[PDB]
Structure formats: structure tokens, C-alpha cells
């Protein structure tokens, strides 16, 4: 069949039932880093089944009136698990993403959801409202965590580009009607063969109602949502201490 | 698969019959915590109402994976998504469903299939475990199976607020036992006559 | 020694990529072949399902009945080259002479593309592209005279002694190619190689350079990529004594032997700052026009 | 409902290794299980009753 | 799938161990070789270097002139099991007719062999044993008279219900061993396997058997090792009334099918508690007899 | 040669002058579990290369009347680097281990050090002096950390055992007339074929000094002992949360 699925790496599986098959951003699977593109000369890591696995980061409730939220990898895992133990302890970092989505509801709900991945995705300021000041976005903006960030002009993206042309980037629809998950399936994407996982972000989520919630009244009124991620072929290099941030 | 009394709480005659199933419902969407158990057969608990712990109270040792599995019976128009950690031994009970899915999991989905399946993997230091009890005889533990919200327990108008899931024991292919001995539990009180 | 077999068939190492799409050669358009009437059930190629994330695939002769057309239309105009390969501003240097801008005769311009919009919006459609350079030095004074005067360009990489007057030491150009050309002369060309430390040039980047605390003072350094940082280009006037004549200078850049990848949404808004992606955010407006009713033209 | 076991083994559901297990299942066997003496009946003989 | 090349060269995996050491056979003791003078330089076998941790390995052939002797004399007295395969006292259950030790007519004795130094002893100059075992039961009053007495002895492996008085539903045996034997009787003597959790009995075992605070009360958790809980020896009269007759029970273990490893250095002091190595601490002896002086015998 | 050896494992090199050979515990070398030996089901990790180097733990000071200190293992680094991470997070644990012991003095300095490794070294009270109370060692003295534990009686050494039938464990000798160190390698020693890291120390290493330490005044009196070690063909199993202890 199509609509039902089960993704199982590592010590975790998961299972769905209204499923939308799998994308695979720009048609190509994660991989290792080859030897005549690898510089560094040290050994790398390859931890295998301890950071290979699905980590669920927290759930958002969905109402009449929200805009949206953006998530920024790997800043959500910079301090989760072995995986975060790596990162800290390590300067170098390579990695792809297996992002599942989940948000279900009842036969009498209505909306769509549009989740879609973005790389190298700066956020810009709003300029002091008049466009004469020089500001900068804070680091709650920047880099809000694994709690996520809010949008705040959604039309724009924060950032000056139009959202009716986001889906250009691997994306999937979540509309009730049809599907309650999405899977987007991402290689790992640089112009370098590693960097940092803490200064650098390589890509960020993004999850915009596109269609709002609708509901009769009598009907449940909380629809949360909810991200799972799981890291697949991790290297690490250039061992030291671990450095906080 | 034998029923599971995960829900061992109730002892009255006229309330027996609620200890075979547990309740899920609409919550805040928060990763709220919903049961926990234990996971050894042969020890007073939750499983001694299977015939696999029935069968385990006679012998001292035993090997292999145990399975469990969870049927819903809600109504036809009722969604949710539920997350089943199991927590290997040596580390104390979750704390909320961040550090619960750390362990081995399987998210489940509500469905045309009313049931998953959570098996529970053998992993030990030791071939075989020894019956433990309270007491200082406890570091041949097993682990603790915790069972958190996902997203929700979604229901349209017209359709019960309030569902209820049975839970099924048994044991695995690998599964074995040893050393034979009298069972604890003696069925008589007088002279039976 | 591999002797576990969780080791020996281990697939940890697969360095090569599976690519699940292939390139497929394409001088023209595609044909259009012939069709017919269909009346059956269990084979509908009008509905889809968008919710998966792909183009709907329904083509012209699943829908309606068509001719046969033998389509010869070139792609050969879209191409990156054909695209990028066209010159436009990017930089201009004033040397006035009495002013507080440049009063000395000479001047140093940080080299960014990112200061004129229309090659910054064409720029910017893309994430990385590698090329080469072709610039082009348009000398003039500000009524657009030609007047014989002689000018030195210097490429100043970064770590170079930026000159400091127009008596500086650094004109000696030991090591560093410098241009010298009269205003009377044609503009000067010159052709530059790709000189990133890394792959590709990137125009966005979500980091920061350094660690540390990351306070007010310290909080420009979002966006900005060392890696764009191409040095400078400094302009003077040969002489010991000050000029006669004031002199604007037009750089013109174009590019060839592309390559892009990751491309991107294109600006819809406004531009402020360099580098800066920030937009004026209580004057936002629409990406195109608007109308009075959706059922009215 | 169907009132079958679910029969999802370890290898579909979790990432394992290879187990070479030599553990034998001689004891469970009925003979085994069966085939220890107790007490079923006493008889009780008194000099006055 | 391997692609890179400290992948496909790795090392990792291998299970294997690498033994620098072989097992020969040795039915008798060595032979002595004819040897003569030798009068040369570079070559020494009577020095040494203790430093490394290895014996010093010069023979009598080397030092001294020696004769040819064809040595004959066996080394099987010296295996595990002739060391070990001998019966000692490991316990002893006293079953009085008044008093408050067992007032009752019943005991149960918890089975580890740590409580006399006989054994003991001999017992850990190793870590770890692998072995069957054999237990015999020489029954008799203090006085050493034999007397008709019925009595039974049960097995109750961990998990089972302890008696609790001597008309205890327990004493059915439905599945528990038991023995009944009569005093004017031989000694019972049954057969024991090898019963551990794990691959072996160890004598010692430096860790707690769970996590969490180390307090006061949880202390005595150190040196307690689960897997040599082997269960409980239950012994009583039979009878619905109290015996006539106060009895003592020995018993006596032979060990058989012996393996160890480990060995470790033998104990020199006074044994207090039971896996318990603990020693007084202000009444330390040496571990021989001692002299007036160095240069007298 | 012989005297001078070089030591390199991971990202660390140990280069000596006044080697004595190596001692290979029980004449085997480290090696992974087997398949017919495992009775775990999951898939266990081995980091290789970020846990296989060599920590330095700490350093003390050799007087004329010292008596002597012991170090549990692996208790020394359940709290050292990725090390220390991976034995907090997982449950099981396997592997050996490669020891190196720095002391060095002047040709004008005498005395000896008795270095051996004793497996499953659990540690006696003195029972509170006559011997009529039952005691046990508290924590400080049964699982001392990094910071070791220095010996009351040294001639029982502690467990009512004689120091001069030491010798029969794997050992060297450092005497400051001939050598400067000493290693031991040591492999994997237990009767299950994988435990806790945490709550089971497998052996303890024990320095005595046998021959007081000896020189003449105006010599320099500070002469430090270092203990320098690294984990071989460490595997990891039975994932879960971090505990602390
Ligand atoms: C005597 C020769 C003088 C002419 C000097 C021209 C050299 C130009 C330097 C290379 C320009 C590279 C093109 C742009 C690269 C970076 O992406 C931009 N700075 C973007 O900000
Ligand atoms: C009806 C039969 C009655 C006789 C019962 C004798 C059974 C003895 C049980 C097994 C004994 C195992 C030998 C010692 C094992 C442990 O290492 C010791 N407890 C050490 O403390």
C-alpha cells in the first residue's frame, strides 16, 4: 500500500496509518564523506546506532489564529543525548535528517499545513518598522532552540520572500482531510565537507497554516502538533573538551 | 496473549471487572503520562495474571523477549497518537516524555488497525535472570514500560469523550525458563474437603 | 579483522550517492502526439493528490484530443550562461575634488555585488554558485567629458597593506596587479578566477564566525561569511600634487562559467542594507497587483 | 480481534545483532514438569478415637 | 556498504583472542641434561632483570655441572580436581528440644560455604569456580547415640515459600526435592549442578547490586553478590507433636568438575564475618614465625 | 631495542627512554565480544577512535614515608570526556584497557614501586579495631574516583591479604636505578560478557612502595607519580537517559 507506513532506525519505530508517501530532498539519500572530498586527516567517528535514532523535541497546539513556527537544525539536538555529548565534545559535524511531522484530528476538522525546508535560511529584521535602523535579530531569534520560534510576519517569512513560491523546497502538505503525518527525507547539504554544528545552522523547518482550523463547536479544540527528527550517517571530528555554546 | 492488569488498582467485588482495561481521553497537549509497569513476569505485580507469569512462578530463571500488545476500543470516529517507551535497566522512572523517549519506543498511530505491538528486547548483563524481590536481590531488575500522550485523544460532536485500551502479554520465540521449583502462592487455607 | 556479523555486513561507509533521478538530454521542446476519446473507469489521470509534494503529471493528451505537432523550439536561451553572462553596475567611486568623501585622491571599495539591486535580485535567486569574473572600469567626469588624465588600479588581497594616501608605499606593486590606463584610453578589462577558500560562493549564511558571548556589540556578525570577503579595490590619481579634474568611476562585472545549486524565493521587498536581509516592516507590500472583486477583471 | 498472537519478532521493530543462542528447552517438557512426588493423602491410625 | 578506506581496512570486529600462550603436555617432572664448563664473555644466563614482571628463567644446566637424570615422578596429585575433591564441614543445624535457637522442631539454613575456615581457605585462592557438587548428611545427638528419628530434608530454590512451622503447607514438596531418611540410616547424600546466573561462582565482587544513595543503611549492599544466593536447606522432624529426641546435623560438601580462574593471594589473617573480608584491625600478625636476628638461625 | 618504546593509540602518543618491556595481562590482548558468547539482543556502539586515546587522571607525590594508593576501575573515568558520557548513558559495558605509570628521578635517587593489577580488589575494614563490630568501607573508600585512596595497612593491604604474594597478578616493578615506567595491558576480566560501568568496578591498581625513597640533602625532595591510561575495543549497550550514578 501507500497510505500506511513504518520508519524504524536505530531503537525507535514509528508507525502511521494516513500516510503521503516520502519525499527525498532533491532526490538523493545521505551518505559518508568520500575520500577524495574529505580535507581534515584525522580519523572521524561514526558513533552508528547511539545518535542514529528519533528524537521527539515538544508539540504546539494549532488554533484559529496562529501564524506559524520555524524550527533550526541542529540547534534543536546541540543538547539532546549522545548526540548532543557529540557535538559539544567534537569541532567538525556531518550529517542528513529524517523529519516526521505529526498532527492529527477528527473527520469534522478542516485545514492544511504546509512543511517545507529551507536551507541556509537567514531571518531578517523588521529595520525599526520605518527601514532606517541597522538592527539585528537577538539570539532567541536567531537561534531559538529546540522550543522553537514564532513567525511573525508570515506573508514575508521574516526574511522578504513570498511563501507562495516556498514550495520550491522539499515540502508536503498536511491537510486533514486526506493525511495526518509528512516525512521529508534531507542529505546533507554544505559547500564544505564539514563544519561546526554549533556556530553554523545548515537549514531551518518551516510549518505555516496555510488554511485556517475550523471546527464546530461541541468538537475538540486542542490540535497539537508535534516534531520527530532522527540524524542518519553522523560523523564527528577534531576531538577537545566540550565547549557549552 | 493473555490479558495484562496493568490497571491494578481496584480490589472491591462490585469493581473487579474495570482492572482489565485503562482509560484515555481528551487532554491539554502537554506529553501527560497515562500508566507504568514493570517488566518482570515472575514477580508480584502486573503480570500475574497471565498464564506466562502463572507459568514463570514455577521456575527461578528465566531468558528472552517479552511482547506486548494494546487494542483500542474506542469509537470508529476517534483519533490520537500515543508514545511506548520501554526504559532499560538501571535508570529510574522517566520523568516526562522528553526523557522517556530515550528508551526503546514505538509511536502509535489510530488507525483500521486496532493494535501495535511493543516488544520489549532482552537485554541483560546475565544468560539468565534469577527471581527478584524486595530487598537487596533487585539488580537482576528488567526496566519500566510508560505509556505518554503524542499529540491527543481528538473526538468530533456526537461520540464518547472517554475510550478505553486492553493490553495482551506473552512471550517470545527465544523465550525459556529453568530450574524448577514450587510456586509461591498456596491455594487453600484449611483442609480441603 | 571483521569476525561479528553486525560488522562483516555492516553498510557504515557507503560513500556514493543514490541518486534516484537522472539528467536527460533536451535541445528542444517536447512533441505533441496524438490522442483520442477515452470512456472507461479505474484509469483517471485528471485527478491528483498535491498533498504529496509533486508536480501533477497530467499532460495534454490524457486530457483533451489533440493534433500532432512537431515541436522545434530551442531551449538554449535559459541556460546559466545564457542568464547570467551580461553585464550590470556594481560599484561606484567618486573623487571629487574638494569634498569630505574622498578628498585625498584616492579611494578603497570593499568588493560586493550585493549594492545594486537589479544584479543583486538575479544573484540571489540561487544559495552557491562558483564562476568566474569579467570586470570593466568606465572613467568619466561628471558632465561625461573625456579629459587626459592617468589612473592606477590596484587589486589588494586581504592581508595586504591597505594604502593610506595617495603618497603611500604600497604603490610600488611588488607583488600585488595593479592597472594603470588613461581616461582618454578604452575602459580597462581584466578577467578574475574563482578565489574561494571553500566550493562555492554563498550569498546567505546562518552563522555566526567566532564563539563567545553573544551580546549587542558582538551581534553583527550574524550573516556574515569571511568567505565573501575578497579583498579591496583601491583607485588613485598618479602624481605628486593634486588633480585637475574631478572623476567617477562605473565598475561593470559579468560572469561566466557558472554553476548553481539550491535555488531560492525571490525578493519581493525593498532593499535596505548590505548583506543585510532586513525589510522595512511597517511598510510591507503585496508581491503583485491587486484588484477590486475576484469575479471581475 | 482476529485472535492470533502478533508474530512482529525483534528484527522488524528494533536494530539487533546477531545472538547465537544455545539454550536448551529439555526442562518444560511434561515428563519434567510432572514427574516429582507429593503428598495426596494421609491416613491416620490411633490407638483411641 | 564499505567505500571508504579506513573503513574497509578496519580493525574493528575482530572477536578473536589472541593467545601469546600454549597448554602442553606434562605427565612427569622435567628431565636434567648433561652439562659442562663454559669460559666465554657476552653470554650470561645468571643475570637477570626482575623489573620487567617475568621469573628468571636460567636452569641448573646453565649455573652448575650437572648429571643426566631421567626424572619419572608423576604431577597428577596437583590437578584441580585431586586438590579439591575431598569432603569438609560446611555447616552445622541444631535442633534442640527446649531453647531458642530452634524452639520449633524446624531450621532453615541459607547455603554458602564462607563459614569455616577449612574450606574457606582453600576456596578462594581463587576468583572464580565452575563445579558440581555432592552433599552428605551425617545426622546424631550430642551425646552421638543414633536414634529412630524420622526426618526430612527439602531444597528450596530462591522464590519459593520459606516454612514457617513444622506443620506448614509447604512441607507437600509438589515440586521442591526433598529427602526423607531415617537416622538409623547411612548418610543421605545427593547430587548438585551447576546452578549460577552466570558462567561461574565468584568468591569476590567489588560493586552494589543497585543504584541510587549509598547511606548508612544502605551499606552492607557491598560484597553482597546475587548470583551466589543459591536458596535455603530446610530440615525437620517429622510429626504432628514434638520429637523425643535433641539432634545436630552436619554437612559435609565434595567438590567435582572443578574450573577456575584467577587466582589471587591466600588469606593470612583471622576470618571474622561471612563475605565479609574484614580483619581486626588492631591485632595485625605476621604472615610467618619470626627470629631474634638476620644472621643467626 | 628494548628500553625505549613509543605508545600511540586515537589522537595521543606516549614516548619513553626507560621502557622495561610490556606486560600483557594473563598473555591476552583486548578483544570485542563474540557471537556465540553475547546474550543481549540490540545492536551494541564502539565509538573507536574518541574513546580509545589516553587520559592522564592525576598526579601524587612520593615522600620517604608514603604507604601507598590504589585506583578503581573503570571508576576513574565514568567522568572523563565521551568516555565518561557513553558509560552514563547506556547500561552495559565491555573493555580492556592499556596502563602507563610515569615516575622519574635523578641517578642520585634509589627506591621501588611495586605496580599490580588485582581484579575484583574489594576492600576490608578493620572491623573497628578488636573486631567485634561489622563495618564496611564507606564511599569514599570503596569507590574513591579520580583522587585514588592511599593505604592504611599496606601489609594486608587492606583486605587481610600478604603484599609479598602480590606478584602472582600482573605487575612491574619501577626502580629509579634501571627503569622510569612501567605498562600493563589488560584485557577484559569478568565472568558475564557484559556489565555495568557504573555500579561494577572490575579491578583495582595498586602502587606500594617496597624500597623507601632515599637521596641526599640538596637533591630535589618533589617527586611526583602520574598515572596515564586508555580504553581498548570499548562496546556500549542498552540506551536510555543519563544517570548520574
Ligand atoms: C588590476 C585588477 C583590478 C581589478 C580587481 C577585480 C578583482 C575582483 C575580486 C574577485 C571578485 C569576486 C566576485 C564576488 C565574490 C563575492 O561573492 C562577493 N564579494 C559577494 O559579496
Ligand atoms: C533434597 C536435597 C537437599 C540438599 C540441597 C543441597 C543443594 C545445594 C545448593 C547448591 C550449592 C551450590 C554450592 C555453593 C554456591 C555458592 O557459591 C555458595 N553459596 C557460596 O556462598
Redesign the pocket.
Known amino acids: 500500500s501507500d497510505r500506511v507506513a513504518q520508519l524504524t532506525i536505530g531503537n525507535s519505530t514509528i508507525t502511521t496509518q494516513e500516510a503521503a508517501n516520502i519525499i527525498v530532498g532533491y532526490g538523493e539519500w545521505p551518505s559518508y564523506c568520500s575520500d577524495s572530498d574529505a580535507t581534515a586527516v584525522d580519523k572521524p567517528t561514526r558513533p552508528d546506532v547511539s545518535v542514529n535514532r528519533f528524537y521527539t523535541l515538544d508539540t504546539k497546539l494549532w488554533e484559529k489564529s496562529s501564524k506559524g513556527w520555524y524550527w533550526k537544525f541542529p540547534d534543536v539536538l546541540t543538547e539532546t543525548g549522545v548526540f548532543g555529548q557529540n557535538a559539544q565534545f567534537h569541532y567538525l559535524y556531518r550529517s542528513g535528517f529524517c523529519i516526521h511531522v505529526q498532527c492529527n484530528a477528527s473527520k469534522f476538522h478542516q485545514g492544511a499545513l504546509l512543511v517545507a525546508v529551507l536551507p541556509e535560511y537567514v531571518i531578517g529584521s523588521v529595520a525599526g518598522g520605518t527601514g532606517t535602523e541597522d538592527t539585528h535579530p537577538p539570539y532567541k531569534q536567531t537561534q531559538p532552540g529546540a522550543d522553537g520560534f514564532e513567525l511573525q510576519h508570515p506573508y514575508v517569512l521574516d526574511a522578504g520572500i513570498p511563501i507562495s513560491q516556498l514550495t520550491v523546497c522539499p515540502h508536503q502538505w498536511i491537510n486533514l482531510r486526506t493525511n495526518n503525518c509528512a516525512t521529508i527525507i534531507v542529505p546533507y547539504i554544505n559547500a564544505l565537507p564539514f563544519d561546526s554544528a554549533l556556530n553554523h545552522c545548515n537549514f531551518g523547518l518551516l510549518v505555516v497554516p496555510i488554511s485556517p482550523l475550523d471546527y464546530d463547536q461541541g468538537a475538540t479544540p486542542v490540535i497539537p502538533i508535534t516534531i520527530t527528527l532522527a540524524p542518519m550517517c553522523s560523523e564527528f571530528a577534531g576531538l577537545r573538551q566540550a565547549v557549552t555554546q | 496473549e493473555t490479558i495484562l492488569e496493568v490497571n491494578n488498582v481496584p480490589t472491591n467485588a462490585t469493581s473487579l471487572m474495570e482492572r482489565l482495561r485503562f482509560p484515555v481521553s481528551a487532554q491539554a497537549g502537554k506529553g501527560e503520562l497515562c500508566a507504568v509497569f514493570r517488566a518482570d513476569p515472575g514477580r508480584s505485580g502486573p503480570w500475574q495474571s497471565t498464564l506466562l507469569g502463572q507459568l514463570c512462578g514455577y521456575y527461578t530463571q528465566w531468558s528472552g523477549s517479552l511482547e506486548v500488545t494494546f487494542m483500542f476500543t474506542g469509537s470508529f470516529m476517534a483519533t490520537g497518537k500515543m508514545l511506548i517507551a520501554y526504559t532499560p535497566p538501571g535508570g529510574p522512572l522517566p520523568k516526562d516524555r522528553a526523557t522517556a523517549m530515550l528508551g526503546t519506543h514505538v509511536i502509535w498511530d489510530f488507525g483500521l488497525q486496532s493494535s501495535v505491538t511493543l516488544v520489549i528486547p532482552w537485554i541483560s548483563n546475565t544468560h539468565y535472570r534469577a527471581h527478584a524481590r524486595d530487598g537487596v536481590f533487585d539488580y537482576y531488575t528488567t526496566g519500566l514500560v510508560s505509556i505518554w500522550y503524542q499529540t491527543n485523544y481528538v473526538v468530533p460532536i456526537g461520540a464518547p469523550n472517554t475510550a478505553y485500551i486492553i493490553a495482551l502479554a506473552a512471550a517470545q520465540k527465544n523465550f525459556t525458563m529453568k530450574l524448577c521449583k514450587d510456586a509461591s502462592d498456596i491455594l487453600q487455607t484449611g483442609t480441603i474437603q | 579483522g571483521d569476525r561479528v556479523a553486525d560488522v562483516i555486513e555492516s553498510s557504515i561507509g557507503d560513500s556514493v550517492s543514490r541518486a534516484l533521478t537522472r539528467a536527460l538530454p533536451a535541445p528542444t521542446g517536447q512533441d505533441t502526439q496524438v490522442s483520442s476519446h477515452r470512456l472507461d473507469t479505474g484509469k483517471v489521470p485528471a485527478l491528483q493528490a498535491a498533498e504529496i509534494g509533486a508536480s501533477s503529471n497530467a499532460s495534454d493528451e490524457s486530457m483533451i484530443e489533440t493534433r500532432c505537432v512537431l515541436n522545434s523550439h530551442s531551449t538554449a536561451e535559459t541556460t546559466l550562461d545564457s542568464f547570467f553572462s551580461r553585464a550590470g553596475l556594481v560599484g561606484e567611486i567618486d573623487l571629487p575634488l574638494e569634498g569630505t568623501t574622498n578628498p585625498n585622491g584616492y579611494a578603497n571599495w570593499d ?4 549594492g545594486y539591486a537589479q544584479m543583486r535580485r538575479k544573484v540571489e535567486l540561487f544559495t552557491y554558485m562558483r564562476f568566474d ?1 569579467e ?1 570593466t572600469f568606465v572613467a568619466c567626469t561628471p558632465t561625461g567629458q573625456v579629459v587626459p588624465q592617468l589612473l592606477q ?3 589588494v588581497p586581504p592581508g595586504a597593506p591597505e594604502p593610506d594616501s595617495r603618497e603611500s608605499l604600497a604603490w610600488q606593486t611588488a607583488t600585488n ?3 594603470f590606463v588613461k581616461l582618454s584610453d578604452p575602459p580597462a578589462q ?1 578577467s ?1 578566477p574563482f ?1 574561494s577558500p571553500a566550493s562555492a ?1 554563498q ?1 546567505f549564511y546562518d552563522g555566526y564566525p567566532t564563539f563567545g558571548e553573544h551580546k549587542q556589540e558582538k551581534d553583527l556578525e550574524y550573516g556574515a561569511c569571511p568567505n ?4 579591496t ?1 583601491s583607485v588613485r590619481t598618479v602624481g605628486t600634487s593634486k588633480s585637475k579634474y574631478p572623476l567617477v568611476i562605473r565598475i561593470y ?1 559579468r560572469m561566466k562559467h557558472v554553476r548553481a545549486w539550491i535555488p531560492r524565493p525571490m525578493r519581493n521587498q525593498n532593499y535596505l542594507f548590505k ?1 543585510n536581509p532586513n525589510y522595512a516592516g511597517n511598510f510591507i507590500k503585496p508581491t503583485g497587483a491587486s484588484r477590486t472583486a475576484i469575479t471581475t477583471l
Open positions: 568588493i560586493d555585488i550585493t569574473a570586470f588600479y590596484m587589486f596587479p595593479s592597472v581584466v578574475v578565489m560562493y550569498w565573501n570577503m575578497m579583498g579595490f562585472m548583506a
